[PDB]
Amino acid sequence: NLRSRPLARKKLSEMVEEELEQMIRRREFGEGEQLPSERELMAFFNVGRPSVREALAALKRKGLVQINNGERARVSRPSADTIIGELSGMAKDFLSHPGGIAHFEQLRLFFESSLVRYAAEHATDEQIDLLAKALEINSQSLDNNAAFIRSDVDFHRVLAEIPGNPIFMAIHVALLDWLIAARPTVTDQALHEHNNVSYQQHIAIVDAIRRHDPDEADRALQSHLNSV
Amino acid sequence: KKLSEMVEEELEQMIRRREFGEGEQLPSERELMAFFNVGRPSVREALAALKRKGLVQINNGERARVSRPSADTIIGELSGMAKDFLSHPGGIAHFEQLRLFFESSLVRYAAEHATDEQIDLLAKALEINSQSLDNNAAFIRSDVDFHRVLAEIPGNPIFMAIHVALLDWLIAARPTVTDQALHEHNNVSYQQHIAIVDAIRRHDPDEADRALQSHLNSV
Amino acid sequence: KKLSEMVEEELEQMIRRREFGEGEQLPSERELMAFFNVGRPSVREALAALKRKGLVQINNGERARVSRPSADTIIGELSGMAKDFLSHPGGIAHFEQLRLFFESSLVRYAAEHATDEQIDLLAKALEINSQSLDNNAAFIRSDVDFHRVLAEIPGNPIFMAIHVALLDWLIAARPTVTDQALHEHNNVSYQQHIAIVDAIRRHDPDEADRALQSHLNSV
Amino acid sequence: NLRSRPLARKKLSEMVEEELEQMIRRREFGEGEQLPSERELMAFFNVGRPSVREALAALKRKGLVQINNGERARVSRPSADTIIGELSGMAKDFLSHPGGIAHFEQLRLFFESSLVRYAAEHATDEQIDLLAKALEINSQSLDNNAAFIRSDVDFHRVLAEIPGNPIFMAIHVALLDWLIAARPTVTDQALHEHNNVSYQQHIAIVDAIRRHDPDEADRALQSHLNSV
Amino acid sequence: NLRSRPLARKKLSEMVEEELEQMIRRREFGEGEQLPSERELMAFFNVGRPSVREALAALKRKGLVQINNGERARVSRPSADTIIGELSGMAKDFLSHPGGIAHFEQLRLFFESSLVRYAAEHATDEQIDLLAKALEINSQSLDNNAAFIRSDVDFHRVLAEIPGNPIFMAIHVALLDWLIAARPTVTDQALHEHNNVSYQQHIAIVDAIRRHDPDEADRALQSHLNSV
Amino acid sequence: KKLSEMVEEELEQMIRRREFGEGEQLPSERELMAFFNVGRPSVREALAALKRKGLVQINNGERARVSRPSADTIIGELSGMAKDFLSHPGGIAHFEQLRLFFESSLVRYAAEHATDEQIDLLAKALEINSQSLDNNAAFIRSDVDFHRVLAEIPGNPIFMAIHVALLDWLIAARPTVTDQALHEHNNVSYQQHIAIVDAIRRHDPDEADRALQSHLNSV
DNA sequence: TTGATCTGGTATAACAGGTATAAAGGTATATCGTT
DNA sequence: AACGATATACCTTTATACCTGTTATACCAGATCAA
């Protein structure tokens, strides 16, 4: 450890991991694979090989580096996706106990209402083409299977991408994944009429956005979320 | 892929299914490894990940246990997230903007189902909120209590958790606080809350949203 | 040429010769490379090709295994092929025309060797086929069951595979289905199947082929 | 990746390959070598050189580009030949187990009967010259070795080319290759008389086609396939 | 070229290739990739990049180096296989004109008779186990297809490997390849009885070798080559 | 793999099929490349390989032609092969041993079909062979003429080519020749050839093979 | 003598192979607990 | 006090990524031939 300090009983792995943390915080490395390999650091610190592996693995969990296969660690910063990855541990309890299912629906409804209100209020002359091509590519009836579902979720994503906030897209993807993960026994009984109703509601929504009237858009969105 | 994450999620869902309660009820990890056809460092990495999460307790050579409280992981995630500040100077305001997208989803709900049982509660809350006198201690406590009783109107435990999380996040983020400017800030805040509760009584969510937007713009 | 394809076909024929069963029975790929005088990226490309095909399983650092089921490559090829639609508008009908070249090779075979043991089977099949009532669920199932029991007359496993492949291909190709027109469609279909089985009993393959051509032209 | 996302443990090669797939599907490239070289894309994505090589190689297998030697990738569409190339993996089992040999023969017989019926029914006044010159160039007895075999397979090919379906010629070539690949110990014992019988049967077939009588043609074809 | 000599009209590629030849003959390099890459030599000689590529390519043809993929040239010596590779250009004429087919058969017969005579005369007490295990693994009747053919050619190879001459194995492999390349329409009509006759003849050959009587072995080999 | 070798073998088989005779009958290589979907350096490498082989002739900017004589490639291969001498000191004797495996396949053939028409030819050959007097000039010429008339007994053009190739190879390999020892060498050679022709007349291939082995062992 | 075409050489780009590094899994050893 | 089980650490193997080298293709320049 370049300082002659064993620290065996007090877990010497903490010493090397905090030394690596300090060396990274000292702005002595770049943003990629500037850090050496495992054997180089092992020989430089006169320690074991599995210790450095555990250190890096713990560091990745803490959200500091990233490794894939046959490449050194790439130092980065913990973004919004890292927080969502570290979370979701208690999400199973919410779907386990009877409640919470309506709470997630209410949260999603509030989020979508807020974002559609912001989009209708800050409606520029360029984002109209995005929603136009979205409703155009989601207008034809060619595949009544899962293609319409992915088209609808892509339309929702491009609608949520209007503000331009990295945390917004992250939480949107997280909520959509947590919602589609709790859809058991999906059957194709009345999904075609559901697709037609969704198309009509999207047409009404874009018409209300063009006319600058969030009331009708909010009513159509509430009706769509109540019809499920 | 990586075996580690597989057995990690397996033991996570096992401890979530309430298969083992308090104490050292887990079997020997050697025969677990022999049955799962995994490696020794994988189990050590899984235990280290669980220790970093804050669910098990390993000191010397004893076995792991369960952890019912969840306050350690909260401050852990707080310290881990409150770091991305020097990268984006104004992007933090985006996070503040997120708070907007939350509060605007609250003042427009009082006119939905609140009839009289919540009106008395918010009135008796704002009574003490206005009776408060201290600028740094009483006014901040009154403001957070008003925000809590506002978030508790729909009756949702997730909303309260999100609100307190945003509160502690902004508290850890903002490093400098004022006293003279905060006085007029909370003054205008409760002056606008008066109009907010007036519009709530009159069943007009537009005026409440406008007052909230003006309060957020006043900073 | 490319060394990769050579060792790929070599390991393919080796795993087809049943040299190694289930599990990690393959030796170390390092000495394999040393004996074959090949390169490191070639082995990685071969393993990636085998993973894309759906015969091996590599997640992290373990060894490859064998894969007995073949349902993943089926849907993989389905998704990979069901794409050339916007290039040729009517050329897809050519594929449908191919189906003709298959069905015309079936109705002309019942008069070859089927005497009575298949007649009872097709009769008890068409019984339930006509007893079906639902337009979108029962009629389509009855039609595919009749097509299956027709293709199973010569007793050929390849014919059944080709038939089910054409079925799933046309299902993935056609994006819009009807209910009112499909009713009369299957009505005329079984009305022509009546004449088809009559001609089969009378040992006349010409009338069956004419009825099949008329059914295909009716769309 | 122009988005600051490591994705090391989750195989970053999938990220770049799906990015390339999306860029190709966005109709931002032509149909040839419009895509840049390996070093250009490597420097643009700030990734490794072997990663882009593996991506392109995987893409070629999926059936999207094509490379030869010293030339950029040519984007195209997976035709019928690509499906046959991706298949044929289970064809060895059929020739391994005792059955299947008669099944392939029955399939080929059904295909040839259907195509000859279509040719006799849609017989125009122009395709007659093709079969005429075919039987003329396959009439003289100059080389009794493998020249007659290739003449016969060329006659079969030009007969199968009458409908004009790209998938038809593809499956015909595939079946002929899979059939000639399973002809062990080909000896020249009675191949001359076989050539004479084949010539007489082709004469009978073209006569039945001229007379518009598929029955005699089908009988002659059945006799030829039974005589082998 | 380190000497200030253009030699443009007289093909300067000859100058650099003869300089490389002299540098190699000066015993200044080892036996592997000791020579630098293409860019290093290009910058050292102040010439073009394709010129060095053509030089190395010509050198490989001359039989001096060897390249595969992503590796420097490995200097070696032209062995017997290089001569066979450079030859075989006029072998197509022999199979084109009617003669020569019996000439190759006579040459192969002379070669096999000479090698079997040498093996029977220099029969030691160790090579008997090789032929014993060969005839043992070629005795069972498990696959009457091409497995017996490859077993027979492996037996012929291990029989030709008795003297221990690198040129002998090279010319043996060359002759066997040139002979199997001229086997058109191989059919499985009487190959099983041919396999039984070959097994009996190999038994007679090994018995004559044990008894030290090359006459019976030569007669059996002549009968086998006449039966084809 | 390498495109170069493909088009090289293609043009080789094309010029072997006698598609183009003498002169510049080949078309423009630009449209050849456009039709073959190859590169420019590949055609240059193929032309360089053909020039090194000795089939085409390119000096400045003209087109390639055909080459009927094959004497240049002979000496080219001779110079290219006569180099591996310092590696294996005694392995060159293996090559000499190969010559054995050739000559032993000749003396045992005279008793097969030669009746009298070849006996007179070999007799009138050995007449002048013995009439020769010079040690370095006449005896070597007599020996090579006797070897030629021996190899020409079965009537095979390939055998003569192989014999002359071995002759020029051994001539280029052996750098030192003697005169006094070569005298007794050829003396014993023809003294053994006397017994060889005697055994050929008596129809006894064993004695001829023994005499040939003794001559080869005498060196 | 000038212009055009063809051939050859050089340079650049792309693909493939090999090597190195990192991560995961398995095995062994040590420590703690229970009988 | 001894034995067994569990946990942690270390080592080895496999996979992935990056870099380097080689080959092929394209472009430019020079030379030769024809008008």
Characterize the main sheet of chain A: none
As a percent range, the share of helical residues of chain A equals 55-70%
Multimeric organization = homohexamer
Gap from first CA to last CA of chain A: 61 Å
The CATH topology of the domain at 86-227 in chain A comes to Four Helix Bundle (Hemerythrin (Met), subunit A)
- What's the level 1 CATH class of the domain at 86-227 in chain A? Mainly Alpha
Number of helices of chain A: 11
How are helices and strands ordered from N to C of chain A? HHHHHHHHHHH
Which two chains share the most extensive interface? Answer: A-B, 36 and 31 residues
CATH architecture of the domain at 86-227 in chain A: Up-down Bundle
Name the beta content range of chain A.
Answer: under 5%
Q: Say how many strands of chain A there are.
A: 0
Rg calculated over all Cα atoms of chain A = 25 Å
| Coarse morphology of chain A | elongated
| Helix-strand makeup class of chain A | mainly alpha
CATH superfamily of the domain at 86-227 in chain A: GntR ligand-binding domain-like
